[PDB]
């Protein structure tokens, strides 16, 4: 039941969801190889709990927009997001995904917050694997309710909870 309504249990389930974040890769472009490199035997996101990698979308909570999001791929990825369980988070990786990037044209979605609800933004080209670790830790403390923005507000645990799906 949304992981809420108990002073202990919401902390417990936020702990669980935050540390057991199970990424759902959507490898698109050169950002995605910097996403793969964050798992090799020098700098691996294989410690916080992200060892296993559920390729199916029915089984994973974190979807990372990793690469330029060409428009012909916008709806498919959309449904990949809709093919996720509801307790799901989406990180926007790179400049091409966060904003239009340098490709400012007819072929690219100029901010992937358009098609999917973004949790964390991570600049870089591609954002260093260590920036990706920093973003997954950002999201870690965000879903515990331990995140505040520049304007002084604490941010909701799960983005994509505030959208009237349709």
């Amino acid at each position: 039941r949304e992981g809420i309504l108990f002073t202990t249990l919401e902390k417990l389930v936020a702990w669980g969801r935050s540390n057991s974040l199970w990424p759902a890769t959507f490898g698109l472009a050169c950002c995605a190889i910097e996403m793969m490199a964050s798992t090799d035997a020098r700098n691996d996101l294989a410690r916080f709990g992200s060892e296993v990698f559920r390729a199916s979308p029915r089984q994973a909570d974190v979807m990372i927009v990793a690469g330029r999001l060409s428009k012909k791929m916008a709806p498919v990825m959309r449904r990949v997001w809709e093919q996720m369980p509801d307790p799901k988070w989406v990180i926007s990786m790179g400049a091409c995904a966060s904003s239009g990037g340098m490709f400012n044209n007819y072929a690219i979605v100029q901010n992937v917050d358009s098609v999917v609800p973004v949790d964390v933004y991570v600049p870089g080209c591609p954002p260093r694997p260590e920036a990706l670790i920093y973003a997954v830790m950002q999201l870690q403390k965000k879903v515990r309710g331990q995140a505040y923005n520049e304007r002084g507000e604490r941010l909701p645990p799960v983005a994509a909870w505030k959208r009237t799906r349709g």
Binding site: K72, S99, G100, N104, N105, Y106, A107
Partner: protein, 196 residues
């Protein structure tokens, strides 16, 4: 060895032979003789069909014969049976209001995808094609992008408090038809080439 005989064959029939001082050769064939001549070209021993590059000269500063122009690349691999290494180009202009061209898919299957791209990017429909279906651009995309009268379709860059940029109004670099920021551009900004 075969490139010399190509030149002797085409120059004998009065087709212009384009050459830059850099070592690449262009051979412009007319529309009619195009298909049959290039069939003879493949028969001449041209294993490999590298490229199909479509061109839109709408906004070119100097006028050109026709707006669209398709260039095929015919090559014979050096390491194959009897390889001279002869590689050359065939340019064929296509009118603005007549975007026709017979395919060489039947000769090289490589023109399956490539010509589709030129049909996708330019308004050029390739005759005799097995499947002329949009390759790259979204299925619902309307138009042909790479022709100059088709917008690049940019989005502004974003900043803090009403401060924005419109890059096409921001560009200090000049195209060919751009007169420049002074009265004009002459000298080394109208074309410059060092003499080795």
């Amino acid at each position: 060895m075969r490139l010399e005989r190509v030149l002797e064959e085409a120059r004998a029939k009065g087709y212009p032979i384009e050459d830059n001082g850099l070592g690449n050769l262009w051979v412009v064939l007319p529309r009619e003789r195009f298909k049959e001549e290039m069939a003879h070209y493949k028969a001449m021993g041209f294993n490999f069909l590298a490229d199909i590059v479509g061109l839109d000269y709408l906004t070119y500063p100097d006028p050109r014969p026709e707006r669209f122009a398709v260039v095929y690349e015919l090559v014979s691999l050096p390491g194959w049976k009897d390889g001279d290494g002869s590689r050359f180009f065939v340019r064929v202009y296509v009118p603005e209001e007549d975007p026709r061209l017979p395919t060489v898919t039947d000769l090289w299957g490589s023109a399956n995808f490539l010509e589709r791209e030129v049909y996708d990017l330019f308004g050029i429909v390739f005759e005799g094609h097995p499947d002329l279906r949009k390759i790259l651009t979204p299925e619902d995309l309307e138009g042909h992008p790479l022709r100059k009268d088709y917008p690049l379709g940019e989005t502004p860059t974003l900043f803090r408090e009403g401060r924005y940029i419109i890059p096409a109004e921001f560009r200090a670099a000049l195209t060919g038809k751009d007169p420049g920021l002074t009265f004009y551009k002459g000298g080394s900004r109208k074309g410059y080439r060092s003499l080795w």
